[PDB]
Amino acid sequence: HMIKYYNINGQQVPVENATLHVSDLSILRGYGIFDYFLAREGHPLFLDDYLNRFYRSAAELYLEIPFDKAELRRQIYALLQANEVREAGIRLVLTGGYSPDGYTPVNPNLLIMMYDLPASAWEFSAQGIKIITHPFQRELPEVKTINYSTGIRMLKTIKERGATDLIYVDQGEWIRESARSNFFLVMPDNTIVTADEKILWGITRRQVIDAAREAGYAVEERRIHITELDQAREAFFTSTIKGVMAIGQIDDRVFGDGTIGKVTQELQDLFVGKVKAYLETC
Amino acid sequence: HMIKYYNINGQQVPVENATLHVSDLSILRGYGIFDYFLAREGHPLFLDDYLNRFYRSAAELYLEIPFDKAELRRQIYALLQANEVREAGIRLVLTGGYSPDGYTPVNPNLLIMMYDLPASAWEFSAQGIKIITHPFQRELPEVKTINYSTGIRMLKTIKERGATDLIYVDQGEWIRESARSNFFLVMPDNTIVTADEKILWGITRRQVIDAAREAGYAVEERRIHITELDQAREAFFTSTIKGVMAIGQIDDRVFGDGTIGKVTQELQDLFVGKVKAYLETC
Numbered sequence A, B: 001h002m003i004k005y006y007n008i009n010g011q012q013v014p015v016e017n018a019t020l021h022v023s024d025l026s027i028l029r030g031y032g033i034f035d036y037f038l039a040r041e042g043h044p045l046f047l048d049d050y051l052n053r054f055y056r057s058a059a060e061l062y063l064e065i066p067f068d069k070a071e072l073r074r075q076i077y078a079l080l081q082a083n084e085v086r087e088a089g090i091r092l093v094l095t096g097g098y099s100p101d102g103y104t105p106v107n108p109n110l111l112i113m114m115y116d117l118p119a120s121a122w123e124f125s126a127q128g129i130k131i132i133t134h135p136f137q138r139e140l141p142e143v144k145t146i147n148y149s150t151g152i153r154m155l156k157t158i159k160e161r162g163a164t165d166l167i168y169v170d171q172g173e174w175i176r177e178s179a180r181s182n183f184f185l186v187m188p189d190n191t192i193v194t195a196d197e198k199i200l201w202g203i204t205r206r207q208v209i210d211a212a213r214e215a216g217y218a219v220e221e222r223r224i225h226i227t228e229l230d231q232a233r234e235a236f237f238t239s240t241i242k243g244v245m246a247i248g249q250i251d252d253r254v255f256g257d258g259t260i261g262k263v264t265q266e267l268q269d270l271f272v273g274k275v276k277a278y279l280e281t282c
């Protein structure tokens, strides 16, 4: 039940022995991709979608995953079994590998790490969070790279300023995403708005959009002007750990009374239904 | 003489045992800074300047280096001594450390790695290299972060296209630097031009500028338009390993007959003199 093992390059290894040699290009060059997904009732959620993303991220960095997707899926199931857990967080990392020259990739290092189910997962607080705008555009935004400098560097500024997250705004004209979350507005006519370009295409994002459309809501995937914050009734984040999370304040703009909006609340319940349905196919 | 040891968190460690645990934020989040400098005759070159840069990079990521600069300088000298080498490459890495939550830094991991003197160091080929333009702007450009995704990802494209390096061009309007080098033009009136903003402030760059000014050349530190490639007689790179390196072709623009330009050649000899002078102070 406590996590006893990780997997490095297809070998189960006690957590206390899970190391990389310092020639690894993630350490020297931040060259890497990753994926992160929850497991509930002994099943990684929406697994084929997270794995297909992981394979697409690897090909963008010209990094070959040593195992095909069936073989990686087996190793993930074997690791859940070996740690004897049903509720977990799971991280896949694929690094540039042990490079001869501290720059050119050779063969990648593959890591499968495992965590308790995050405590906050799908908390679904009724009180929206408070975030700040930050001018920035992520590099290679469509690839899930290991590159979180700006997001991490900003943690002092976020806290200093009374916030618990931020939203990136490309040349401070275009709303994108947080470091770790996709961003949605709900207009007063109940139209759901989210960025279509220069973002990471979240799996959670995909499930909430599909669930919104199935419930008969209008969803626009489009460029979002900074000024549309002024027109929106609601704002929320999506991610693997957040599920759907109500944002109550961006800078001095309070959405409603700061509590979770109507459509936001309906989208939380639909996401929990997307998960329940997923688990019934396993 | 072969490298026997690295230093991790103030402890000398055999190279074969130099590892980090996979919770290190450089591995999970590419959160890190580094520095790299040569040693000749048993002395790291321009050391105080590289160390002051290393300390400035750390403070930008809010990462405290555990030792003051005198103590780090001692550890570097002790490591050269223990490996019994006079000619070396030296890498300092400071990672986000072993984070509890795979995101928030706690205390950093400090690495001192050591290499043979790179074979190519200050090669000073008379034949200029061939590079391509690439549209891109480095994140946090003034900090020497471990984030080289774009530069590394581009290696296939560079080689495919008949090149051995690139030059980054900010919104393809403004000339900046390569992934690993500063970039200079020499105008037909012998004015030396280099970017002043949104670049890493190289140590080599600093020494070549000082040496050019002392020789009585005009040096402009200014924004450089893409179209000024058309006006330049010469182009060169600077970096710790290149020293000064002649660029003979950018895309279909051949500088002269592709061989090292006049001022470029004089700046190579002045840099070797900057190094010789440095070593006489040790």
Ligand SMILES: *Cc1c(COP(=O)(O)O)cnc(C)c1O
Pocket: A144, A177, A178, A179, A180, A181, A182, A200, A201, A202, A203, A204, A205, A238, A239, A240, A241
């Ligand atoms: C991981 C990540 C997300 C969330 O994607 P999910 O698949 O929903 O967890 C969003 N944006 C960025 C930048 C991310 O790295």
Ligand SMILES: *Cc1c(COP(=O)(O)O)cnc(C)c1O
Pocket: B144, B177, B178, B179, B180, B181, B182, B200, B201, B202, B203, B204, B205, B238, B239, B240, B241
């Ligand atoms: C390290 C580096 C340089 C070169 O700096 P030097 O101190 O001259 O080696 C140039 N540009 C970038 C982006 C670098 O990381």
